[PDB]
Design a protein around this ligand. Structure first.
Ligand SMILES: COc1cc(/C=C/C(=O)O)ccc1O
Length: 272
């Protein structure tokens, strides 16, 4: 019963008086991938009961951000609770990683350059080898692709699409809010040639995402027409997905909240 909306109503992205919201806890954990101690926020659902098990959404920030950045607007914490209260989302655990996970010897200062991007690309290893096992060991989670969502903004949305299609066996639900250039070959004004992580014909999955969703503002000054280009390539490749544009929005929380609002309505069987 999917009804995509091109904006998030204020009442779903705002904390409502008299409603309890979950809180983030910052976790420090060791990564064999970066060979360093790293941080992530874990947001347990209201009333978290260790004798229950919960599905998990991993939500990835953009370039030059960090694990608290998706908490700077209340949509992240408010939307899943506000949908839950209307029976339109499932109870879930939300994880906000630090997505910049360079191998030792390759950490560089944030900037629009290929060497800095490599640390985001390496997040596929951080997520699968370190963060997912940590969550299974330390929290009462549901495992399996039907219980696992991955979404992100801008560079984190590029990274979500890359991981969600290359390892669709692990990730049931993929959400990409204004994804950055360079999943596939391309060229832009911020850093010139992007060689592409994969070719366009390779941007596909053997086992299909249960849900793949992509959005973007119509006037995004940072990633421009790249999200639309991904829609077009996925369509050419017969990859089922949802695409929509947020009218007049830029690289901003209107585009993000619209994406997350539609995405969380689909995750974990919420539509039955
Ligand atoms: C990978 O190349 C790019 C990444 C971005 C990401 C911006 C963001 O995450 O806010 C913007 C322009 C680029 O050329």
């Amino acid at each position: 019963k999917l009804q995509i909306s091109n904006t998030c109503p204020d009442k779903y992205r705002t904390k409502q008086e008299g409603v309890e919201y979950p809180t983030a806890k910052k976790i420090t954990y060791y990564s064999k991938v970066t060979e360093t101690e790293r941080k992530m926020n874990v947001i347990l659902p209201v009333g978290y009961d260790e004798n229950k098990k919960y599905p998990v959404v991993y939500y990835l920030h953009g370039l030059m951000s960090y694990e608290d950045s998706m908490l700077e607007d209340d949509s992240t914490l408010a939307i899943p609770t506000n949908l839950l209260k209307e029976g339109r989302a499932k109870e879930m655990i939300i994880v906000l990683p630090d997505v910049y996970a360079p191998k030792p010897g390759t950490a560089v200062t944030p900037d629009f350059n290929p060497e800095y991007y490599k640390g985001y690309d390496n997040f596929i290893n951080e997520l699968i080898e370190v963060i997912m096992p940590y969550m299974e060991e330390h929290y009462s989670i549901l495992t399996g692709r039907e219980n696992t969502a991955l979404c992100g903004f801008s560079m984190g949305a590029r990274t979500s699409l890359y991981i969600g299609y290359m390892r669709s066996d692990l990730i049931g639900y993929v959400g990409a809010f204004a994804p950055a250039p360079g999943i596939t070959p391309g060229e832009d004004s911020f850093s010139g040639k992007h060689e592409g992580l994969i070719s366009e014909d390779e941007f596909r999955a053997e086992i299909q995402p249960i849900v793949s969703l992509i959005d973007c503002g119509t006037n995004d000054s940072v990633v421009g027409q790249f999200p639309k280009s991904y829609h077009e390539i996925l369509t050419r490749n017969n990859q089922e997905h949802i695409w929509f544009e947020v009218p007049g929005a830029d690289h901003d929380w209107n585009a993000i909240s619209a994406g997350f609002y539609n995405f969380i309505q689909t995750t974990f069987g919420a539509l039955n």
